[PDB]
Design an enzyme around this catalytic site. Structure first.
Site, PDB file in Angstrom:
ATOM      1  N   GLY A  21      48.630  52.833  44.303  1.00 27.69           N
ATOM      2  CA  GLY A  21      47.523  52.280  43.530  1.00 27.69           C
ATOM      3  C   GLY A  21      46.937  50.999  44.079  1.00 27.69           C
ATOM      4  N   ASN A  23      46.859  48.047  44.859  1.00 26.34           N
ATOM      5  CA  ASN A  23      47.751  46.889  44.752  1.00 26.34           C
ATOM      6  C   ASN A  23      49.213  47.277  44.945  1.00 26.34           C
ATOM      7  OD1 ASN A  23      46.549  44.235  44.254  1.00 26.34           O
ATOM      8  ND2 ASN A  23      45.715  45.091  42.348  1.00 26.34           N
ATOM      9  N   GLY A  24      49.626  48.365  44.294  1.00 26.99           N
ATOM     10  CA  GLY A  24      51.041  48.709  44.224  1.00 26.99           C
ATOM     11  C   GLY A  24      51.407  50.178  44.145  1.00 26.99           C
ATOM     12  N   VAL A  26      53.748  53.321  42.716  1.00 24.17           N
ATOM     13  CA  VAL A  26      54.169  53.708  41.375  1.00 24.17           C
ATOM     14  C   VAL A  26      55.489  54.468  41.462  1.00 24.17           C
ATOM     15  CG1 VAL A  26      53.551  54.945  39.264  1.00 24.17           C
ATOM     16  CG2 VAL A  26      51.764  53.854  40.639  1.00 24.17           C
ATOM     17  N   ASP A 130      36.413  52.913  38.942  1.00 26.49           N
ATOM     18  CA  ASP A 130      37.203  53.743  39.852  1.00 26.49           C
ATOM     19  C   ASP A 130      37.588  55.067  39.203  1.00 26.49           C
ATOM     20  OD1 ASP A 130      38.157  53.865  42.500  1.00 26.49           O
ATOM     21  OD2 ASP A 130      40.209  53.367  41.906  1.00 26.49           O
TER      22      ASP A 130
END
Ligand SMILES: O=C(Nc1cc(-c2cc3c([nH]2)[C@]2(CCCNC2)CNC3=O)ccn1)c1cccc(C(F)(F)F)c1
Length: 270
Positions: A21, A23-24, A26, A130
């Protein structure tokens, strides 16, 4: 309210990854007291990551939005991190479920679900920015599963433009729902042969190139095809067949849509 003790005091982490995602990553995890499987999103602390948690908390509670359970502020290998614990959406992605009759009425139901989610965010002055296939997930693989929207890594607290980008996304998703390929436009036969005029009309009003002419969410929700989604014809569609048939370029259309949303987020374009 962000918990500052270690996330692993409350959750048992696993090494299974659901996906990336921006940024990060999951990860799956399990609450220790209850048995519940949950999803954990690791974000390295930054203004942007703080805006995401903020926008997601605010959105969490609305209809057809993936709920936050807890947020942790932790140290991880010497770096400060925000961990979003979400409900686990184990039903998978919208269009994956579909390629696994699929009628126009069912598509209206789905678009109404996504619409209610965007209605909630927009009335709370949040643009998602998004909305795309891999951010639309089902809660379970069962028949009663609930479709929900995730990923507020690009969300913005609002303006009319940023909101109109969400409405464009609804038009593109609706288009792919109705036939199995994206508008990258026209309505080509034989796939668009028995699709109603209201469906095509609504999509034309959403895919307008000029954002000011684009339908508002409240106009989207009041359109007969959405407002009266329960009396849309039970007309069988090609989508499921088309998706399985074209499975080998699904990653391409996802990449293409990600790219299109990215360019709509730019400050200056052309
Ligand atoms: O992804 C699953 N559960 C899930 C996933 C998320 C999730 C959040 C985010 C994402 N997923 C992505 C992953 C990469 C694609 N974009 C979206 C990046 N950004 C996010 O913010 C949240 C909650 N539960 C899942 C779990 C078990 C089984 C299945 C499957 F259906 F695939 F078998 C899926």
């Amino acid at each position: 309210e962000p918990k500052k003790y270690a996330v692993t005091d409350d959750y048992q982490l696993s090494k299974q990854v659901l996906g990336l995602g921006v940024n990060g990553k999951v990860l799956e995890c399990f609450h220790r007291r209850t048995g519940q499987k949950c999803a954990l999103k690791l974000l390295y602390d930054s203004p942007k990551a703080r805006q995401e948690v903020d926008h997601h908390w605010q959105a969490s509670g609305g209809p057809h939005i993936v709920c936050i359970l807890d947020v942790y502020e932790n140290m991880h290998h010497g770096k400060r991190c925000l961990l979003i614990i979400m409900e686990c959406m184990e039903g998978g992605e919208l269009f994956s479920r579909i390629q696994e009759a699929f009628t126009e009425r069912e598509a209206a139901e789905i678009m109404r679900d996504i619409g209610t989610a965007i209605q909630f965010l927009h009335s709370h002055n949040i643009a998602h920015r998004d909305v795309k296939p891999e951010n639309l997930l089902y809660t379970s693989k069962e028949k009663d599963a609930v479709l929900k929207l995730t990923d507020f890594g690009f969300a913005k607290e609002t303006e009319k433009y940023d909101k109109s980008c969400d409405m464009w996304s609804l038009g593109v998703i609706m288009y792919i729902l109705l036939c199995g390929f994206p508008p990258f436009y026209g309505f080509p036969n034989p796939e668009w042969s028995e699709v109603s005029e209201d469906a095509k009309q609504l999509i034309r009003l959403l895919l307008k190139t000029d954002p000011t002419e684009r339908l508002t969410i409240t106009q989207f929700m009041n359109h007969p095809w959405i407002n009266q989604s329960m009396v849309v014809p039970q007309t069988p569609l090609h989508t499921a067949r088309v998706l399985q048939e074209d499975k080998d370029h699904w990653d391409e259309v996802k990449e293409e849509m990600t790219s299109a949303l990215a360019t709509m987020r730019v400050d200056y374009d052309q």
